[model samples]
Target: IRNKAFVVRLYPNAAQTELINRTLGSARFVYNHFLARRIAAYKESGKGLTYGQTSSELTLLKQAEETSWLSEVDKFALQNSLKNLETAYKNFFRTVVGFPRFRKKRTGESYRTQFTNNNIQIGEGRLKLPKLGWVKTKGQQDIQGKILNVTVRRIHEGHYEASVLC
Candidate 1:
């Protein structure tokens, strides 16, 4: 079946807002950190770093004392960030796109997470996210397909939305 996404405005409370911001920060950090690692690895080994390699390194990074804050966000969001980087690398080789660049602040702030067990759910006037609990949403509630993933994005200051893919 084909995939589709339903965009809905999200009203996150103070705590959820903090978590969302942290998730966005961590996701961007992971992407940029690994992009740097990939560049360095290529210089030393003459081979690009693989997603599997980065994934393992990320596990270690979370346990590291200095970067313990990485664990505060959804693990899938961090993993998806790495996956995005991998896709960028692949696209660079396949097309005319250049190497992946580091993510910057004040730009598309967002993080994506996949559906698992019952982590994602939709109710009458709210939606449940991975770490963020039920949040008020304003949009079409009649979803049609199997929920695959969701991308939470801060479109502008104090404005957030979720795109649920199915």
Candidate 2:
């Protein structure tokens, strides 16, 4: 089997650009925070919170008064962050790599989100991400698929790129 993908360099307006950064920022926070929690729990109890446990707690966190801001971006992105960490954990056990590493803001600045029904709309020069709305992009060709996921990444130059997984 084969997977299809498409990617584009983004040309977001001031607002969309800000939202793009926010999406990545939130995911980065989610991953790092959860990873830290796991490390702490392991040190204290010789065990870390499981994937399902962390995911469920994240729901309460989003609804909490202090972290309500998390609701501003796509929830899927946050879920994906935890999913990534869990995958890393599994890989570590399999000897694919070392233990999941804590992500720094400057390094792991990206978020992966998927489509729900028709939450995403596509066009020649733009795309709509859930909650993020429409943002301009430059792509080489039309990518046809029910978008499986999109990984939005921030390059060091502060530009954004999106890799659409289909």
Candidate 3:
């Protein structure tokens, strides 16, 4: 028999709310900007790059190019999104289906972020955020791995979330 999984809820703070919004905005910006770059590249070179290729190029651009205004907004968020995207692709290639999906802003729906890691503890029910102290998790479900990343989100029902990965 297969094991069943359940979804858990989390409560974040006001600062966390702002952080999530900024991160989501940064991620969306990066996605759209890269897509535009790829389309333009294809039109000019008669070649289309795969997601991996585009991701690599974007990483280089982020480091080398100073023309992208969005990069100035939050360097950390942009870099984190890039890292997360890479992880998502790696998971997809390794047969971990349903990875690399981006969150969207729908009417009455708030944006949620998903992070992955390998060293989450179940008993703690707490997460440590940069500049923001520890926030509470809904349950004590322990996740494993090196704490890959943490995602802060705002739900449509006017609540915030902090989804950890393991």
lDDT of each prediction vs. the true structure?
0.90, 0.80, 0.54
- How many residue pairs clash per model? 0, 0, 10
Residue 28's lDDT in candidate 1: 92
lDDT of 1 by residue, 1-166 (tens): 9998888889899999889999999999999999999999989987878999999999999989999999888999999999999999999989867778887896568799999898889777899898998988888458788998889999887899999888
Q: Judge candidate 1 at residue 90 and give its lDDT.
A: 92
lDDT-wise, the better of 1 and 3 is 1
Ranking by TM-score: 1, 2, 3
1-166: candidate 2 lDDT, tens digit per residue: 4567788876778887778778778887889889988888889997789999999888988988987878888888999989998998889879757788876668447787888788766778887777767778887348676677777778765678878777
Lowest-scoring 10 consecutive residues by lDDT in candidate 3?
107-116
Instruction: Give the C-alpha miss distance for residue 104 in model 1, angstroms.
Output: 1.3
lDDT accuracy of residue 142 in candidate 2 = 85
Off by over 4 Å in 2: none
What is the lDDT, from 0 to 100, of the residue 85 in candidate 1?
93
Q: How does candidate 1 score on lDDT?
A: 0.90
The better candidate by TM-score, 1 or 2, is 1
lDDT of 2: 0.80
TM-score of each: 0.96, 0.89, 0.55
Residue 35's lDDT in candidate 1: 94
Candidate 3 lDDT, 1-166, residue by residue in tens = 3332223455666775555565567666676566566557769897755666766776676666564554443444565555555566568769947735544654232233233342233346666554344666676465544344444555664566555544
